Amino acid sequence: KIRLYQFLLDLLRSGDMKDSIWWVDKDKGTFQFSSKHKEALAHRWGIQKGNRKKMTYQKMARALRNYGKTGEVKKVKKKLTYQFSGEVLGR
DNA sequence: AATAAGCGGAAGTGGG
DNA sequence: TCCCACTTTCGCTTA
C-alpha cells in the first residue's frame, strides 16, 4: 500500500486536487493544504487505503506528525504548511 | 462562546 | 514475536 508521503507527493505532481493542496516553494519541497478544501483530500486518502472509518484531516495530520522523527515530512511554522525531505524529493 | 490549527498518551489494525 | 505504517480515540493548548 502507498505511503502517505507518496500519496501527497503524487497529488502535487499530478495536479489532480489543486484546490486542496499546492506547492509553496517546490524547490524546497514546501507545500500547503487548503483550509476549506483539505477534508476532500483526506477523504481520498482514506478511501485509497481502504480504512474502516472515514478519514479526517486531523487523523491524516496526526500521521504526518509521526514523520517528524524520521524526517520524510516536517511541519513548517506556517499555517497548514509542511516540507518533504530531500531524500523523499529525490526518490 | 465558536471556530480552527496543532499536539500527543494510549491502544487498535495491517501486513509482514 | 514483534515491528511497520499508520489509524482511531480523546483531552489539551493557543490564537
mmCIF file of all heavy atoms in Angstrom, chain B:
data_model
loop_
_atom_site.group_PDB
_atom_site.id
_atom_site.type_symbol
_atom_site.label_atom_id
_atom_site.label_comp_id
_atom_site.label_asym_id
_atom_site.label_seq_id
_atom_site.Cartn_x
_atom_site.Cartn_y
_atom_site.Cartn_z
ATOM 1 O "O5'" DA B 1 -18.181 29.140 25.990
ATOM 2 C "C5'" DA B 1 -19.446 29.757 26.132
ATOM 3 C "C4'" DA B 1 -19.964 30.231 24.786
ATOM 4 O "O4'" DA B 1 -19.262 31.441 24.394
ATOM 5 C "C3'" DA B 1 -19.769 29.243 23.646
ATOM 6 O "O3'" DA B 1 -20.890 29.281 22.783
ATOM 7 C "C2'" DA B 1 -18.491 29.731 22.968
ATOM 8 C "C1'" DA B 1 -18.529 31.236 23.197
ATOM 9 N N9 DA B 1 -17.217 31.863 23.367
ATOM 10 C C8 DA B 1 -16.477 31.895 24.514
ATOM 11 N N7 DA B 1 -15.348 32.545 24.396
ATOM 12 C C5 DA B 1 -15.342 32.967 23.079
ATOM 13 C C6 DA B 1 -14.418 33.717 22.347
ATOM 14 N N6 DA B 1 -13.278 34.178 22.869
ATOM 15 N N1 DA B 1 -14.697 33.963 21.048
ATOM 16 C C2 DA B 1 -15.851 33.523 20.543
ATOM 17 N N3 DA B 1 -16.811 32.811 21.143
ATOM 18 C C4 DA B 1 -16.488 32.570 22.428
ATOM 19 P P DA B 2 -21.190 28.078 21.779
ATOM 20 O OP1 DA B 2 -22.630 28.182 21.444
ATOM 21 O OP2 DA B 2 -20.657 26.827 22.364
ATOM 22 O "O5'" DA B 2 -20.317 28.421 20.485
ATOM 23 C "C5'" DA B 2 -20.711 29.484 19.638
ATOM 24 C "C4'" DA B 2 -19.800 29.579 18.430
ATOM 25 O "O4'" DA B 2 -18.543 30.150 18.829
ATOM 26 C "C3'" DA B 2 -19.460 28.246 17.757
ATOM 27 O "O3'" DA B 2 -19.589 28.388 16.349
ATOM 28 C "C2'" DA B 2 -18.018 27.974 18.198
ATOM 29 C "C1'" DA B 2 -17.474 29.380 18.303
ATOM 30 N N9 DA B 2 -16.357 29.563 19.202
ATOM 31 C C8 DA B 2 -16.242 29.087 20.483
ATOM 32 N N7 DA B 2 -15.145 29.469 21.090
ATOM 33 C C5 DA B 2 -14.510 30.280 20.148
ATOM 34 C C6 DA B 2 -13.299 30.995 20.180
ATOM 35 N N6 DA B 2 -12.495 31.021 21.241
ATOM 36 N N1 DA B 2 -12.941 31.680 19.069
ATOM 37 C C2 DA B 2 -13.752 31.659 18.007
ATOM 38 N N3 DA B 2 -14.924 31.039 17.865
ATOM 39 C C4 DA B 2 -15.245 30.354 18.985
ATOM 40 P P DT B 3 -19.383 27.134 15.372
ATOM 41 O OP1 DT B 3 -20.277 27.343 14.217
ATOM 42 O OP2 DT B 3 -19.490 25.900 16.189
ATOM 43 O "O5'" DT B 3 -17.869 27.279 14.898
ATOM 44 C "C5'" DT B 3 -17.451 28.477 14.296
ATOM 45 C "C4'" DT B 3 -15.952 28.488 14.118
ATOM 46 O "O4'" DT B 3 -15.309 28.660 15.384
ATOM 47 C "C3'" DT B 3 -15.369 27.201 13.540
ATOM 48 O "O3'" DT B 3 -14.927 27.445 12.236
ATOM 49 C "C2'" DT B 3 -14.225 26.827 14.496
ATOM 50 C "C1'" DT B 3 -14.023 28.106 15.281
ATOM 51 N N1 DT B 3 -13.479 27.951 16.650
ATOM 52 C C2 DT B 3 -12.310 28.585 16.970
ATOM 53 O O2 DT B 3 -11.667 29.237 16.175
ATOM 54 N N3 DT B 3 -11.914 28.431 18.261
ATOM 55 C C4 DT B 3 -12.550 27.714 19.251
ATOM 56 O O4 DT B 3 -12.091 27.635 20.385
ATOM 57 C C5 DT B 3 -13.770 27.053 18.852
ATOM 58 C C7 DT B 3 -14.551 26.233 19.845
ATOM 59 C C6 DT B 3 -14.183 27.218 17.588
ATOM 60 P P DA B 4 -14.382 26.249 11.318
ATOM 61 O OP1 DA B 4 -14.584 26.656 9.914
ATOM 62 O OP2 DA B 4 -14.962 24.975 11.807
ATOM 63 O "O5'" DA B 4 -12.820 26.218 11.625
ATOM 64 C "C5'" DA B 4 -12.064 27.387 11.457
ATOM 65 C "C4'" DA B 4 -10.658 27.181 11.948
ATOM 66 O "O4'" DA B 4 -10.641 27.176 13.387
ATOM 67 C "C3'" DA B 4 -10.031 25.866 11.509
ATOM 68 O "O3'" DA B 4 -8.931 26.152 10.653
ATOM 69 C "C2'" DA B 4 -9.632 25.172 12.826
ATOM 70 C "C1'" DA B 4 -9.630 26.322 13.826
ATOM 71 N N9 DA B 4 -9.912 25.981 15.231
ATOM 72 C C8 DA B 4 -11.025 25.371 15.738
ATOM 73 N N7 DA B 4 -11.012 25.246 17.051
ATOM 74 C C5 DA B 4 -9.821 25.833 17.433
ATOM 75 C C6 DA B 4 -9.211 26.039 18.699
ATOM 76 N N6 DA B 4 -9.744 25.641 19.855
ATOM 77 N N1 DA B 4 -8.019 26.662 18.724
ATOM 78 C C2 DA B 4 -7.477 27.061 17.567
ATOM 79 N N3 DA B 4 -7.957 26.935 16.324
ATOM 80 C C4 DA B 4 -9.138 26.305 16.326
ATOM 81 P P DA B 5 -8.145 24.994 9.872
ATOM 82 O OP1 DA B 5 -7.888 25.526 8.516
ATOM 83 O OP2 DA B 5 -8.842 23.702 10.039
ATOM 84 O "O5'" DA B 5 -6.778 24.891 10.676
ATOM 85 C "C5'" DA B 5 -5.959 26.016 10.780
ATOM 86 C "C4'" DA B 5 -4.889 25.817 11.821
ATOM 87 O "O4'" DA B 5 -5.502 25.622 13.122
ATOM 88 C "C3'" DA B 5 -3.979 24.609 11.587
ATOM 89 O "O3'" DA B 5 -2.617 25.056 11.590
ATOM 90 C "C2'" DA B 5 -4.333 23.655 12.741
ATOM 91 C "C1'" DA B 5 -4.838 24.607 13.812
ATOM 92 N N9 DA B 5 -5.784 24.054 14.784
ATOM 93 C C8 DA B 5 -6.987 23.452 14.539
ATOM 94 N N7 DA B 5 -7.644 23.111 15.630
ATOM 95 C C5 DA B 5 -6.810 23.523 16.656
ATOM 96 C C6 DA B 5 -6.929 23.487 18.062
ATOM 97 N N6 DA B 5 -7.959 22.931 18.708
ATOM 98 N N1 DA B 5 -5.922 24.013 18.789
ATOM 99 C C2 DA B 5 -4.884 24.565 18.152
ATOM 100 N N3 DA B 5 -4.665 24.669 16.843
ATOM 101 C C4 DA B 5 -5.679 24.137 16.145
ATOM 102 P P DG B 6 -1.387 24.104 11.179
ATOM 103 O OP1 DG B 6 -0.267 25.065 10.968
ATOM 104 O OP2 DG B 6 -1.742 23.180 10.070
ATOM 105 O "O5'" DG B 6 -1.112 23.319 12.536
ATOM 106 C "C5'" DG B 6 -0.490 24.035 13.580
ATOM 107 C "C4'" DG B 6 -0.444 23.257 14.870
ATOM 108 O "O4'" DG B 6 -1.784 23.018 15.363
ATOM 109 C "C3'" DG B 6 0.218 21.878 14.783
ATOM 110 O "O3'" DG B 6 1.489 21.920 15.450
ATOM 111 C "C2'" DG B 6 -0.793 20.945 15.472
ATOM 112 C "C1'" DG B 6 -1.696 21.931 16.212
ATOM 113 N N9 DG B 6 -3.032 21.439 16.516
ATOM 114 C C8 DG B 6 -4.037 21.107 15.636
ATOM 115 N N7 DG B 6 -5.126 20.679 16.230
ATOM 116 C C5 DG B 6 -4.821 20.760 17.590
ATOM 117 C C6 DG B 6 -5.594 20.416 18.728
ATOM 118 O O6 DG B 6 -6.753 19.975 18.774
ATOM 119 N N1 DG B 6 -4.885 20.612 19.907
ATOM 120 C C2 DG B 6 -3.602 21.102 19.980
ATOM 121 N N2 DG B 6 -3.082 21.231 21.204
ATOM 122 N N3 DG B 6 -2.871 21.424 18.926
ATOM 123 C C4 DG B 6 -3.538 21.225 17.772
ATOM 124 P P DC B 7 2.508 20.676 15.424
ATOM 125 O OP1 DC B 7 3.861 21.231 15.673
ATOM 126 O OP2 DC B 7 2.232 19.770 14.289
ATOM 127 O "O5'" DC B 7 2.100 19.841 16.697
ATOM 128 C "C5'" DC B 7 2.280 20.405 17.962
ATOM 129 C "C4'" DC B 7 1.682 19.526 19.021
ATOM 130 O "O4'" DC B 7 0.256 19.498 18.879
ATOM 131 C "C3'" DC B 7 2.098 18.056 18.955
ATOM 132 O "O3'" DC B 7 3.203 17.827 19.785
ATOM 133 C "C2'" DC B 7 0.854 17.293 19.416
ATOM 134 C "C1'" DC B 7 -0.193 18.382 19.608
ATOM 135 N N1 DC B 7 -1.533 18.018 19.140
ATOM 136 C C2 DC B 7 -2.435 17.478 20.053
ATOM 137 O O2 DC B 7 -2.066 17.306 21.225
ATOM 138 N N3 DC B 7 -3.687 17.180 19.641
ATOM 139 C C4 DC B 7 -4.036 17.380 18.373
ATOM 140 N N4 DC B 7 -5.283 17.059 18.012
ATOM 141 C C5 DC B 7 -3.119 17.919 17.409
ATOM 142 C C6 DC B 7 -1.890 18.230 17.838
ATOM 143 P P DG B 8 3.957 16.415 19.737
ATOM 144 O OP1 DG B 8 5.248 16.600 20.427
ATOM 145 O OP2 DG B 8 3.899 15.924 18.340
ATOM 146 O "O5'" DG B 8 3.053 15.467 20.643
ATOM 147 C "C5'" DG B 8 2.953 15.698 22.037
ATOM 148 C "C4'" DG B 8 2.083 14.643 22.679
ATOM 149 O "O4'" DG B 8 0.707 14.793 22.212
ATOM 150 C "C3'" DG B 8 2.467 13.206 22.334
ATOM 151 O "O3'" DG B 8 2.292 12.373 23.452
ATOM 152 C "C2'" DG B 8 1.492 12.872 21.225
ATOM 153 C "C1'" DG B 8 0.252 13.547 21.751
ATOM 154 N N9 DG B 8 -0.796 13.715 20.759
ATOM 155 C C8 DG B 8 -0.642 14.014 19.423
ATOM 156 N N7 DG B 8 -1.771 14.077 18.773
ATOM 157 C C5 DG B 8 -2.728 13.776 19.733
ATOM 158 C C6 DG B 8 -4.125 13.670 19.615
ATOM 159 O O6 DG B 8 -4.818 13.828 18.612
ATOM 160 N N1 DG B 8 -4.719 13.340 20.818
ATOM 161 C C2 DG B 8 -4.040 13.128 21.999
ATOM 162 N N2 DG B 8 -4.786 12.811 23.059
ATOM 163 N N3 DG B 8 -2.732 13.230 22.130
ATOM 164 C C4 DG B 8 -2.139 13.539 20.958
ATOM 165 P P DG B 9 3.476 11.412 23.951
ATOM 166 O OP1 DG B 9 4.490 12.268 24.602
ATOM 167 O OP2 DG B 9 3.867 10.553 22.814
ATOM 168 O "O5'" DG B 9 2.775 10.501 25.062
ATOM 169 C "C5'" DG B 9 2.069 11.117 26.123
ATOM 170 C "C4'" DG B 9 1.070 10.164 26.750
ATOM 171 O "O4'" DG B 9 -0.220 10.286 26.087
ATOM 172 C "C3'" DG B 9 1.421 8.688 26.651
ATOM 173 O "O3'" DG B 9 0.935 8.025 27.793
ATOM 174 C "C2'" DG B 9 0.703 8.265 25.379
ATOM 175 C "C1'" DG B 9 -0.589 9.041 25.520
ATOM 176 N N9 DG B 9 -1.288 9.311 24.277
ATOM 177 C C8 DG B 9 -0.745 9.786 23.103
ATOM 178 N N7 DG B 9 -1.629 9.947 22.161
ATOM 179 C C5 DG B 9 -2.829 9.593 22.751
ATOM 180 C C6 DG B 9 -4.118 9.579 22.199
ATOM 181 O O6 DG B 9 -4.454 9.924 21.056
ATOM 182 N N1 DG B 9 -5.075 9.147 23.114
ATOM 183 C C2 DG B 9 -4.805 8.761 24.405
ATOM 184 N N2 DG B 9 -5.859 8.364 25.140
ATOM 185 N N3 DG B 9 -3.585 8.762 24.939
ATOM 186 C C4 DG B 9 -2.646 9.190 24.046
ATOM 187 P P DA B 10 1.322 6.504 28.090
ATOM 188 O OP1 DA B 10 1.284 6.357 29.562
ATOM 189 O OP2 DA B 10 2.546 6.182 27.323
ATOM 190 O "O5'" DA B 10 0.111 5.685 27.450
ATOM 191 C "C5'" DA B 10 -1.216 6.056 27.765
ATOM 192 C "C4'" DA B 10 -2.201 5.422 26.808
ATOM 193 O "O4'" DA B 10 -2.168 6.095 25.534
ATOM 194 C "C3'" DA B 10 -1.934 3.956 26.502
ATOM 195 O "O3'" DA B 10 -2.896 3.167 27.164
ATOM 196 C "C2'" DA B 10 -2.020 3.850 24.965
ATOM 197 C "C1'" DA B 10 -2.614 5.189 24.556
ATOM 198 N N9 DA B 10 -2.194 5.697 23.249
ATOM 199 C C8 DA B 10 -0.923 6.022 22.860
ATOM 200 N N7 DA B 10 -0.849 6.504 21.639
ATOM 201 C C5 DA B 10 -2.164 6.494 21.193
ATOM 202 C C6 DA B 10 -2.761 6.885 19.972
ATOM 203 N N6 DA B 10 -2.072 7.371 18.934
ATOM 204 N N1 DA B 10 -4.096 6.745 19.855
ATOM 205 C C2 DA B 10 -4.783 6.253 20.889
ATOM 206 N N3 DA B 10 -4.341 5.872 22.084
ATOM 207 C C4 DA B 10 -3.007 6.009 22.172
ATOM 208 P P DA B 11 -2.816 1.571 27.117
ATOM 209 O OP1 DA B 11 -3.595 1.063 28.273
ATOM 210 O OP2 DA B 11 -1.405 1.177 26.927
ATOM 211 O "O5'" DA B 11 -3.584 1.218 25.772
ATOM 212 C "C5'" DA B 11 -4.912 1.648 25.615
ATOM 213 C "C4'" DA B 11 -5.401 1.373 24.218
ATOM 214 O "O4'" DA B 11 -4.707 2.240 23.286
ATOM 215 C "C3'" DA B 11 -5.163 -0.062 23.715
ATOM 216 O "O3'" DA B 11 -6.347 -0.553 23.127
ATOM 217 C "C2'" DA B 11 -4.043 0.109 22.701
ATOM 218 C "C1'" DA B 11 -4.381 1.477 22.150
ATOM 219 N N9 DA B 11 -3.312 2.137 21.415
ATOM 220 C C8 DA B 11 -1.999 2.269 21.774
ATOM 221 N N7 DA B 11 -1.273 2.912 20.888
ATOM 222 C C5 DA B 11 -2.185 3.223 19.882
ATOM 223 C C6 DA B 11 -2.058 3.887 18.655
ATOM 224 N N6 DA B 11 -0.908 4.392 18.207
ATOM 225 N N1 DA B 11 -3.164 4.008 17.892
ATOM 226 C C2 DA B 11 -4.313 3.491 18.325
ATOM 227 N N3 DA B 11 -4.562 2.857 19.466
ATOM 228 C C4 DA B 11 -3.441 2.738 20.198
ATOM 229 P P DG B 12 -6.460 -2.065 22.592
ATOM 230 O OP1 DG B 12 -7.672 -2.599 23.226
ATOM 231 O OP2 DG B 12 -5.194 -2.828 22.661
ATOM 232 O "O5'" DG B 12 -6.756 -1.892 21.032
ATOM 233 C "C5'" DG B 12 -7.933 -1.239 20.612
ATOM 234 C "C4'" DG B 12 -7.981 -1.166 19.102
ATOM 235 O "O4'" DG B 12 -6.935 -0.279 18.621
ATOM 236 C "C3'" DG B 12 -7.771 -2.495 18.389
ATOM 237 O "O3'" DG B 12 -8.696 -2.604 17.350
ATOM 238 C "C2'" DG B 12 -6.329 -2.420 17.898
ATOM 239 C "C1'" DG B 12 -6.150 -0.936 17.644
ATOM 240 N N9 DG B 12 -4.770 -0.481 17.758
ATOM 241 C C8 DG B 12 -3.936 -0.616 18.835
ATOM 242 N N7 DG B 12 -2.738 -0.123 18.627
ATOM 243 C C5 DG B 12 -2.792 0.373 17.334
ATOM 244 C C6 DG B 12 -1.803 1.036 16.566
ATOM 245 O O6 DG B 12 -0.636 1.319 16.887
ATOM 246 N N1 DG B 12 -2.267 1.365 15.299
ATOM 247 C C2 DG B 12 -3.538 1.107 14.836
ATOM 248 N N2 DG B 12 -3.798 1.490 13.579
ATOM 249 N N3 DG B 12 -4.474 0.484 15.548
ATOM 250 C C4 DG B 12 -4.035 0.161 16.785
ATOM 251 P P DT B 13 -8.762 -3.919 16.441
ATOM 252 O OP1 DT B 13 -10.191 -4.051 16.073
ATOM 253 O OP2 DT B 13 -8.075 -5.081 17.046
ATOM 254 O "O5'" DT B 13 -7.941 -3.501 15.153
ATOM 255 C "C5'" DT B 13 -8.375 -2.426 14.367
ATOM 256 C "C4'" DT B 13 -7.590 -2.393 13.081
ATOM 257 O "O4'" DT B 13 -6.243 -1.946 13.351
ATOM 258 C "C3'" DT B 13 -7.441 -3.750 12.377
ATOM 259 O "O3'" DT B 13 -7.727 -3.589 10.986
ATOM 260 C "C2'" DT B 13 -5.979 -4.142 12.656
ATOM 261 C "C1'" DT B 13 -5.320 -2.781 12.662
ATOM 262 N N1 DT B 13 -4.039 -2.642 13.383
ATOM 263 C C2 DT B 13 -3.014 -1.923 12.780
ATOM 264 O O2 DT B 13 -3.063 -1.485 11.626
ATOM 265 N N3 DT B 13 -1.907 -1.748 13.565
ATOM 266 C C4 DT B 13 -1.727 -2.171 14.862
ATOM 267 O O4 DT B 13 -0.687 -1.951 15.478
ATOM 268 C C5 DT B 13 -2.835 -2.904 15.442
ATOM 269 C C7 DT B 13 -2.725 -3.428 16.834
ATOM 270 C C6 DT B 13 -3.939 -3.081 14.697
ATOM 271 P P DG B 14 -7.812 -4.862 10.008
ATOM 272 O OP1 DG B 14 -8.919 -4.566 9.068
ATOM 273 O OP2 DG B 14 -7.865 -6.091 10.828
ATOM 274 O "O5'" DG B 14 -6.413 -4.855 9.236
ATOM 275 C "C5'" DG B 14 -5.944 -3.659 8.668
ATOM 276 C "C4'" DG B 14 -4.585 -3.830 7.972
ATOM 277 O "O4'" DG B 14 -3.500 -3.585 8.889
ATOM 278 C "C3'" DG B 14 -4.287 -5.196 7.344
ATOM 279 O "O3'" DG B 14 -4.055 -4.977 5.970
ATOM 280 C "C2'" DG B 14 -3.037 -5.714 8.102
ATOM 281 C "C1'" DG B 14 -2.397 -4.427 8.563
ATOM 282 N N9 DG B 14 -1.553 -4.460 9.759
ATOM 283 C C8 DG B 14 -0.394 -3.751 9.943
ATOM 284 N N7 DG B 14 0.112 -3.865 11.135
ATOM 285 C C5 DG B 14 -0.795 -4.669 11.811
ATOM 286 C C6 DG B 14 -0.785 -5.095 13.140
ATOM 287 O O6 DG B 14 0.063 -4.849 14.007
ATOM 288 N N1 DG B 14 -1.880 -5.918 13.422
ATOM 289 C C2 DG B 14 -2.870 -6.240 12.525
ATOM 290 N N2 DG B 14 -3.850 -7.055 12.979
ATOM 291 N N3 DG B 14 -2.906 -5.811 11.278
ATOM 292 C C4 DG B 14 -1.840 -5.035 10.986
ATOM 293 P P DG B 15 -3.906 -6.183 4.922
ATOM 294 O OP1 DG B 15 -4.290 -5.621 3.615
ATOM 295 O OP2 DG B 15 -4.553 -7.410 5.453
ATOM 296 O "O5'" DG B 15 -2.350 -6.463 4.919
ATOM 297 C "C5'" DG B 15 -1.466 -5.448 4.533
ATOM 298 C "C4'" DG B 15 -0.057 -5.857 4.844
ATOM 299 O "O4'" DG B 15 0.147 -5.817 6.285
ATOM 300 C "C3'" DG B 15 0.298 -7.284 4.413
ATOM 301 O "O3'" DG B 15 1.526 -7.286 3.701
ATOM 302 C "C2'" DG B 15 0.406 -8.038 5.733
ATOM 303 C "C1'" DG B 15 0.900 -6.946 6.645
ATOM 304 N N9 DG B 15 0.748 -7.223 8.067
ATOM 305 C C8 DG B 15 -0.253 -7.918 8.699
ATOM 306 N N7 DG B 15 -0.079 -8.008 9.990
ATOM 307 C C5 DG B 15 1.109 -7.329 10.219
ATOM 308 C C6 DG B 15 1.808 -7.086 11.417
ATOM 309 O O6 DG B 15 1.520 -7.442 12.568
ATOM 310 N N1 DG B 15 2.972 -6.360 11.192
ATOM 311 C C2 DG B 15 3.405 -5.924 9.965
ATOM 312 N N2 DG B 15 4.543 -5.227 9.953
ATOM 313 N N3 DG B 15 2.754 -6.133 8.836
ATOM 314 C C4 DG B 15 1.622 -6.844 9.041
ATOM 315 P P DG B 16 1.930 -8.525 2.778
ATOM 316 O OP1 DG B 16 3.011 -8.037 1.888
ATOM 317 O OP2 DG B 16 0.705 -9.121 2.209
ATOM 318 O "O5'" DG B 16 2.543 -9.592 3.800
ATOM 319 C "C5'" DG B 16 3.961 -9.727 3.950
ATOM 320 C "C4'" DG B 16 4.553 -8.604 4.792
ATOM 321 O "O4'" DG B 16 3.816 -8.485 6.043
ATOM 322 C "C3'" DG B 16 6.009 -8.817 5.198
ATOM 323 O "O3'" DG B 16 6.715 -7.591 5.175
ATOM 324 C "C2'" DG B 16 5.893 -9.391 6.604
ATOM 325 C "C1'" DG B 16 4.698 -8.633 7.137
ATOM 326 N N9 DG B 16 3.985 -9.283 8.226
ATOM 327 C C8 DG B 16 2.808 -9.989 8.157
ATOM 328 N N7 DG B 16 2.400 -10.424 9.309
ATOM 329 C C5 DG B 16 3.375 -9.990 10.197
ATOM 330 C C6 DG B 16 3.466 -10.131 11.595
ATOM 331 O O6 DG B 16 2.699 -10.734 12.354
ATOM 332 N N1 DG B 16 4.600 -9.485 12.106
ATOM 333 C C2 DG B 16 5.525 -8.821 11.356
ATOM 334 N N2 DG B 16 6.567 -8.310 12.029
ATOM 335 N N3 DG B 16 5.443 -8.676 10.044
ATOM 336 C C4 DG B 16 4.337 -9.257 9.540
#
